[PDB]
Amino acid sequence: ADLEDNMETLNDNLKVIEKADNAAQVKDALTKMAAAAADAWSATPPKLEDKSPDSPEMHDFRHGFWCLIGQIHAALHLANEGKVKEAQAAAEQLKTTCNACHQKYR
Amino acid sequence: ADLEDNMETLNDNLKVIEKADNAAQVKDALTKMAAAAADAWSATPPKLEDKSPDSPEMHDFRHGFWCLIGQIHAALHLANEGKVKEAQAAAEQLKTTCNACHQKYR
Amino acid sequence: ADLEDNMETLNDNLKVIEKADNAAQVKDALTKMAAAAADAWSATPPKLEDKSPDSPEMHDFRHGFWCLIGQIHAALHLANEGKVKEAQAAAEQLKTTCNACHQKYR
Amino acid sequence: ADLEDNMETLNDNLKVIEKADNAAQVKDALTKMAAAAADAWSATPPKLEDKSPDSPEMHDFRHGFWCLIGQIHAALHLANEGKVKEAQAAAEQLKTTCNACHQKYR
Amino acid sequence: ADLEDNMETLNDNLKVIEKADNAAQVKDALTKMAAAAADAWSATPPKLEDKSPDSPEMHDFRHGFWCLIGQIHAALHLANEGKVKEAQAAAEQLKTTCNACHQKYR
Amino acid sequence: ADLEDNMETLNDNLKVIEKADNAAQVKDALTKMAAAAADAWSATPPKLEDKSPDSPEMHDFRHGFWCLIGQIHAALHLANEGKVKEAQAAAEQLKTTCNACHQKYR
Amino acid sequence: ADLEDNMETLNDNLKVIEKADNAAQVKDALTKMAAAAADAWSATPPKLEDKSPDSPEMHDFRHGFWCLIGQIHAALHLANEGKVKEAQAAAEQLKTTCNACHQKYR
Amino acid sequence: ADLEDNMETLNDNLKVIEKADNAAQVKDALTKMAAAAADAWSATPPKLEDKSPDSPEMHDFRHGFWCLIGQIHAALHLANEGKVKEAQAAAEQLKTTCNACHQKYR
Amino acid sequence: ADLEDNMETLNDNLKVIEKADNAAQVKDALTKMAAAAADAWSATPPKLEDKSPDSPEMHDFRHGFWCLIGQIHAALHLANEGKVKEAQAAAEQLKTTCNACHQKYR
Amino acid sequence: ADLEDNMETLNDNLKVIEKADNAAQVKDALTKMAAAAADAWSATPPKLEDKSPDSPEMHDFRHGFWCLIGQIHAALHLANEGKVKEAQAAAEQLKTTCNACHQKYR
Amino acid sequence: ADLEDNMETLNDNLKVIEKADNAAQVKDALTKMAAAAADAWSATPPKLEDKSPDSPEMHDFRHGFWCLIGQIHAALHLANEGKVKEAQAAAEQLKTTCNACHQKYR
Amino acid sequence: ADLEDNMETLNDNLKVIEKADNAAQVKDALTKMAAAAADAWSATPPKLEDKSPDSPEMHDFRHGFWCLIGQIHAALHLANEGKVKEAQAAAEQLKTTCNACHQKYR
Amino acid sequence: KTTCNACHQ
Amino acid sequence: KTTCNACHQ
Amino acid sequence: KTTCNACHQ
Numbered sequence A, B, C, D, E, F, G, H, I, J, K, L: 001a002d003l004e005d006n007m008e009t010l011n012d013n014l015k016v017i018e019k020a021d022n023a024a025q026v027k028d029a030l031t032k033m034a035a036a037a038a039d040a041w042s043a044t045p046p047k048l049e050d051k052s053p054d055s056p057e058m059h060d061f062r063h064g065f066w067c068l069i070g071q072i073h074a075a076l077h078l079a080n081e082g083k084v085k086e087a088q089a090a091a092e093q094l095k096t097t098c099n100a101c102h103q104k105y106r
Numbered sequence M, N, O: 001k002t003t004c005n006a007c008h009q
């Protein structure tokens, strides 16, 4: 999957979590998000193609995904415990991280 | 995944196949489509909720997915041979089946 | 397992679902039913032994099992979501399919 | 494998079954037949290459393999029970299904 | 599975073994019996619910299953050698253990 | 792990079960207890090092662990059914078995 | 393997352990002993072939192998820690268990 | 496992490594430590609960675990070579990282 | 295993094959023989200790094992077809190969 | 499979390689050839039935298969690099080896 | 592997990639590089053997491998899509990362 | 891998074995050597490009690798027993075989 | 899963 | 599962 | 699991 595909996966599964009424659906969606973020971590976005791999921008970009992966993990930990509403709240909070990276590099 | 989620998966991956330039991408997308169809085939769509399980409508509905799964296999066979353009052409034919079920039941 | 064994498995696990008070027990029972139906699909019942494999009766017979497998799948989808009562209701509805095939071919 | 390859596999293994004196040989041959028939299920034969997938013709073609797969399954069930003569008889019965499709579509 | 379910599994499969005409069927049935006994050994039967876990009654109860599991293994060993009649004779001996526990605790 | 390590594992996971508010945490803790007890069963405690392997003391010692393993299994059966409070009650009752062996051999 | 085969395996591997100069050799030998003792556990020896499975005699016979298995486990634990001399000493101690059963039942 | 449980796992296994006299024991303990750190890295500690996810404090917190995981790998590499004393020395160095995070955030 | 131990394995399993009354037993014994011979293939026997790897004797020694391995395969093929007596006769013919090598190098 | 059946497998897959237009198809065919040749290696052909395993003819017969297996590997290596035409040419050269053995022993 | 071994692997496989004419060769080489870089990530180089793990220096050293791993991942993504020239170009870009670390720490 | 790359693998791992101070390192290196030699076995070297597969030279070339593979196995057996110095000496003796082939065909 | 397994396995 | 695994594994 | 899998696999 390319960066855009991984973003579609992220966006789609966030919506799935929002509408979900059971732990299994939340777990599955978060698992897909984790895999999408893991694939996207190594990518170079269009607006940073001219930048050095060792640039503050590229460091910050990759950092965003590991921030996101960590938060996905915390959400899944809650979902695995059957705590649907708490995992949904945690998934809602992911958006801050989505937005922050977008504001800079999308 | 609910019916809507599976439809989103089908749609997204059919678009991935169109824009694809390599066999692996086409194979991945088709694999994801087969899994979505495997989940969806046993669902009951909103417009057929008040219908009998042995109704002509539900027979036809289930049959549409089996047709789709068959066609995905033909496309997979081609992608496994590395024939990107042929697999893509086979995937376009899938859309006839998508269209037919939608015309009746969506 | 022979046809009679598979029927015993179907009958037993239907009762298990009825008395169940948790998702795990419902899931396990439905999983066993699916496997029993899958094994029974290819069988030839005593009252159709004289019939052609391509006969309307043999078509209808095999069709009943795939109808049953689909309904088992829908029930399990509900059970996997922790929806015990809904899965139990879905399992109750299976009986129509059990009865229909029996009335004709048992 | 292509359509002709799969037909060669089916024909070769029918011969292996006929001459077999042990269950292992019969089981192995039937397994190869199952694989070949499963692959042929999604193929389009030369005489239907212009036809609709939703056509009476392609419907019927696919149905023929589904029928054959069911019959191979039944023979396999017998071979797994070490019943050489019975499995050989079941394999012999397959020929009517082979022939029916050939008459229409070969 | 509850105690009753495991008893149903034991009973059904012991009957499968009696009527069996092949080693695979006997092996499958014995395998299912061992799994049911593995589940049941740690249960507390209705008639021993008010007894201490270290009571002679609960010691004896658990011991009955270990005896059963041992005998299933002796039957499995024979079935694995394809000795259908000997495995069947070994399975009949199992019934002494079934009877003994029932006489005391059922 | 040595006997002392296995005891630490037993003690730690008992506390985990007590404070737990979900089935997954209870299941995981009991699974770890089962593995710890299984490893400890074959050990020789300091106060029985001078005793024969065939001694009433060594018989009684090994017996305690299988008593414990059985009770852990019953607790896990409850936890697998999502019955958290009942599994926690069952885990509480384990202490009798812990204490009994300690009073004699610790 | 039959009873005599398993005894040959036990005897051969005790000799391998005694002459061993490395942990891998000791671990491998003890693993083979574990397998042999596990298989012998459900065997009926010539001198008890007429006896009750619930008899003091068959009880005691089975118990002897359970005892031996525990001791092999303990020796295996040591070999896994690379402790050649200690594992060899543990293997030597097994002989008392071997001998006890032979005295009664060989 | 919650943060406290993972800390207990880290502490217990670090003590196992100190007292260890063999490579397998050291490797097992380090493996358990890596799994606990993998779980803990995405947690939010009580003293940082009111902090932003992108705060210097949470950056530093996550970073501490990544440092720890790195050091566990260096210790594992040595244990895999059977170098018990060197692996133990490497594990002692881990404590600097334990101490640093505690000083700030515990 | 050392050479002597592999030889013990060859010798014991030849005796097992001789006394066997079922295919499984013969198959099991031949499988163990194949493994022992495969290990022994690269060994240097005491009587050829000062000889070069490229020496006429060491070529001959290795060839002896390749010879034996080929015959074990032929016997295995027969056992896998359930042809007990034929497999036993093939095993008996191995002795020529055993004896020939012994005369030169044992 | 018997020798004749392995030969049918060799012959059919040589034809598949000749007509192939992709690497996957060539790889698949060569893999099946390798398996057939490996099985045939330990067979005794009708024309050498009364001959000794250590006879000049049987050495030559086995060498023929080792020769063929080596060439199939070389062709497989080429197919795995996607070099279709080169792999086809290597397969065509196999015929020399097929023919040479046939002239002597078929 | 030690640090020098891993550097040899990285260097060797960069050369393999440069000379490669097929995707399989490129993918295999990049996989070996990934493994080598992952192992080197937790190593301590001679020039930093006295340094703090929490030092600017060891931080930076580890960061260099994390950077390299990300870049190898990106190249691997391309190789998996059969894009030889593009993956070779991505591999070439790695050299800046190799060089940066060498300048500081070699 | 091509022949040159397999040779680089042989050469590098021989150096690793020479400098090794533990069994794991020697085992790892020998395992990689075995794989490289196995691949090289079916290669045709530049200097024998116009030669027949059945030529005296190609027989000799393949034999050289079989010779090396046998010695690597012998060394591996020693490494697996933790006999580091003995395994190193066996690896050193490989050089005779390396050199002999090079003199003729490199 | 059942329809899929019916062919593949 | 535990008793079973104690022998088999 | 994700960070771990990123290297190992």
Ligand code: HEM
Pocket (backbone or CB within 6 Å): A003, A004, A007, A008, A010, A011, A014, A045, A046, A060, A061, A062, A063, A064, A065, A068, A094, A095, A097, A098, A099, A101, A102, A105, A106
């Ligand atoms: C769960 C959180 C996130 C969501 C829901 C999300 C969603 C999206 C969506 C819907 C798009 C548009 C895709 C398209 O053009 O078709 C996009 C693009 C993009 N996102 Fe994200 N995203 C998330 C996290 C992140 C993070 C953490 C980063 C940076 C570290 C990031 C970087 C980007 C970039 C660079 C693009 C532009 C891709 C391109 O134009 O090729 N996203 N995102």
Ligand code: HEM
Pocket (backbone or CB within 6 Å): B003, B004, B007, B008, B010, B011, B014, B045, B046, B060, B061, B062, B063, B064, B065, B068, B094, B095, B097, B098, B099, B101, B102, B105, B106
């Ligand atoms: C690969 C071919 C197909 C594609 C690309 C596709 C795509 C879609 C999309 C994008 C939607 C809208 C989902 C939404 O509400 O967000 C949809 C809905 C729907 N589709 Fe499909 N579909 C395909 C095959 C099928 C088949 C074969 C059937 C029937 C056998 C079917 C039946 C339906 C139904 C009943 C809905 C309405 C869902 C609802 O409102 O709950 N589709 N489809």
Ligand code: HEM
Pocket (backbone or CB within 6 Å): C003, C004, C007, C008, C010, C011, C014, C045, C046, C060, C061, C062, C063, C064, C065, C068, C094, C095, C097, C098, C099, C101, C102, C105, C106
């Ligand atoms: C969950 C639904 C079903 C249940 C609970 C069920 C139950 C049973 C039971 C208890 C028997 C008697 C077995 C015996 O004689 O020992 C039986 C027989 C039979 N059933 Fe079913 N069944 C179900 C579904 C079906 C379906 C869908 C079909 C046809 C497609 C079918 C066809 C038959 C036939 C042909 C027999 C007679 C077997 C014989 O006499 O050899 N059943 N069933």
Ligand code: HEM
Pocket (backbone or CB within 6 Å): D003, D004, D007, D008, D010, D011, D014, D045, D046, D060, D061, D062, D063, D064, D065, D068, D094, D095, D097, D098, D099, D101, D102, D105, D106
């Ligand atoms: C086990 C039963 C079957 C056997 C033994 C068998 C055998 C064969 C053989 C030997 C051929 C000639 C292949 C060639 O031209 O190279 C063939 C061709 C063909 N078969 Fe079958 N077949 C079987 C089942 C079926 C079924 C069930 C169908 C249809 C559903 C079918 C459809 C065809 C078609 C369309 C051809 C012509 C292929 C072409 O000309 O490209 N076959 N079959």
Ligand code: HEM
Pocket (backbone or CB within 6 Å): E003, E004, E007, E008, E010, E011, E014, E045, E046, E060, E061, E062, E063, E064, E065, E068, E094, E095, E097, E098, E099, E101, E102, E105, E106
């Ligand atoms: C293979 C041998 C066995 C067979 C065939 C067998 C069969 C059965 C059957 C058919 C039932 C009636 C279940 C129902 O209520 O629907 C039952 C009940 C029972 N059995 Fe067994 N059983 C066997 C072994 C054992 C053993 C070894 C024990 C004790 C160690 C035991 C203890 C019980 C108990 C306590 C009940 C009463 C269950 C309840 O009312 O909750 N059984 N058995």
Ligand code: HEM
Pocket (backbone or CB within 6 Å): F003, F004, F007, F008, F010, F011, F014, F045, F046, F060, F061, F062, F063, F064, F065, F068, F094, F095, F097, F098, F099, F101, F102, F105, F106
């Ligand atoms: C869940 C139940 C159990 C718990 C919570 C538990 C807990 C403990 C604890 C915390 C210790 C002290 C460890 C140390 O010295 O560091 C210990 C020691 C010991 N326990 Fe247990 N235990 C349990 C079950 C058992 C059972 C069933 C037995 C006997 C069958 C047993 C036998 C022993 C022995 C012999 C020691 C002394 C070990 C030594 O000094 O080397 N325990 N136990």
Ligand code: HEM
Pocket (backbone or CB within 6 Å): G003, G004, G007, G008, G010, G011, G014, G045, G046, G060, G061, G062, G063, G064, G065, G068, G094, G095, G097, G098, G099, G101, G102, G105, G106
């Ligand atoms: C590691 C400890 C053991 C060793 C080394 C060992 C060794 C042997 C050997 C060499 C034989 C002679 C086999 C033959 O006649 O061909 C034998 C026979 C026998 N052993 Fe063991 N044994 C051990 C443990 C046991 C145990 C624990 C029991 C009872 C629980 C037992 C019961 C028997 C019996 C009943 C025979 C007579 C078999 C027959 O005559 O068919 N053995 N043993």
Ligand code: HEM
Pocket (backbone or CB within 6 Å): H003, H004, H007, H008, H010, H011, H014, H045, H046, H060, H061, H062, H063, H064, H065, H068, H094, H095, H097, H098, H099, H101, H102, H105, H106
């Ligand atoms: C191997 C090194 C480590 C060891 C041995 C260790 C050990 C411990 C122990 C024994 C506790 C007390 C747990 C309890 O309340 O029962 C604790 C608490 C804590 N540790 Fe660690 N730890 C280590 C690494 C770390 C690291 C790297 C961090 C931060 C990056 C950290 C942060 C904390 C925090 C925040 C608490 C408080 C937990 C709470 O009160 O909820 N630890 N640690």
Ligand code: HEM
Pocket (backbone or CB within 6 Å): I003, I004, I007, I008, I010, I011, I014, I045, I046, I060, I061, I062, I063, I064, I065, I068, I094, I095, I097, I098, I099, I101, I102, I105, I106
């Ligand atoms: C199935 C056929 C074979 C059987 C049954 C067999 C059996 C035996 C036995 C029982 C021993 C004595 C081991 C001991 O000292 O305890 C032995 C030793 C030996 N065998 Fe074999 N063997 C067979 C095949 C071979 C072959 C094919 C070769 C040569 C290629 C061979 C070479 C040797 C050598 C060199 C020894 C002496 C080992 C030493 O003294 O260290 N054997 N064999």
Ligand code: HEM
Pocket (backbone or CB within 6 Å): J003, J004, J007, J008, J010, J011, J014, J045, J046, J060, J061, J062, J063, J064, J065, J068, J094, J095, J097, J098, J099, J101, J102, J105, J106
């Ligand atoms: C890829 C190369 C080869 C091909 C295409 C091939 C093909 C065939 C075919 C089609 C048959 C007739 C089978 C039948 O009766 O139905 C046959 C028979 C035979 N082949 Fe081959 N073969 C090959 C390699 C070899 C080799 C290398 C050997 C000797 C080492 C060999 C030895 C034999 C023998 C002995 C028979 C007679 C079998 C019998 O009558 O029972 N073949 N081969």
Ligand code: HEM
Pocket (backbone or CB within 6 Å): K003, K004, K007, K008, K010, K011, K014, K045, K046, K060, K061, K062, K063, K064, K065, K068, K094, K095, K097, K098, K099, K101, K102, K105, K106
């Ligand atoms: C793919 C990129 C890289 C390549 C091709 C490469 C290649 C090499 C080579 C050929 C050596 C000489 C090995 C020897 O002395 O035997 C070496 C040494 C070294 N490299 Fe790299 N390297 C790469 C990446 C890195 C990175 C990213 C770092 C730091 C983060 C690094 C740190 C070092 C160090 C510290 C040495 C000295 C080792 C010593 O003297 O023991 N390398 N490298």
Ligand code: HEM
Pocket (backbone or CB within 6 Å): L003, L004, L007, L008, L010, L011, L014, L045, L046, L060, L061, L062, L063, L064, L065, L068, L094, L095, L097, L098, L099, L101, L102, L105, L106
């Ligand atoms: C462990 C023992 C061996 C070592 C250390 C070794 C090492 C090497 C090395 C370093 C090269 C140069 C590769 C290059 O051009 O970069 C080479 C080339 C070569 N080796 Fe070996 N080798 C060994 C075994 C063998 C054997 C046993 C044979 C023959 C059976 C052989 C045949 C060749 C040939 C034909 C070349 C030339 C490759 C070419 O020019 O394309 N080698 N070897």
Ligand code: HEM
Pocket (backbone or CB within 6 Å): B030, B031, B034, B035, B037, B038, B069, B073, B076, B080, D035, D038, D039, D040, D041, D069, M001, M003, M004, M005, M006, M007, M008
């Ligand atoms: C709805 C359930 C099914 C799913 C999700 C599914 C999925 C797939 C996928 C993803 C592949 C590609 C494997 C790969 O190359 O990685 C495949 C291959 C294949 N499928 Fe299915 N399939 C299903 C049902 C069936 C059925 C019912 C048949 C038989 C009529 C079948 C026959 C085959 C065959 C012959 C292949 C090629 C060989 C193989 O990989 O097994 N599939 N399937």
Ligand code: HEM
Pocket (backbone or CB within 6 Å): H030, H031, H034, H035, H037, H038, H069, H073, H076, H080, K035, K038, K039, K040, K041, K069, O001, O003, O004, O005, O006, O007, O008
């Ligand atoms: C937090 C997640 C991780 C966990 C739980 C973890 C755990 C482990 C464990 C237990 C081992 C020892 C394997 C054995 O010998 O049995 C290992 C080995 C290893 N790890 Fe990790 N690790 C993690 C992350 C990573 C990362 C991010 C990297 C790459 C930067 C990495 C690279 C390696 C390498 C190169 C080895 C040695 C070769 C291998 O077994 O794969 N690990 N890891």
Ligand SMILES: [Zn+2]
Pocket (backbone or CB within 6 Å): A001, A002, A039, K077
């Ligand atoms: Zn991707």
Ligand SMILES: [Zn+2]
Pocket (backbone or CB within 6 Å): A053, A054, A055, A059, K063, K067
């Ligand atoms: Zn950087």
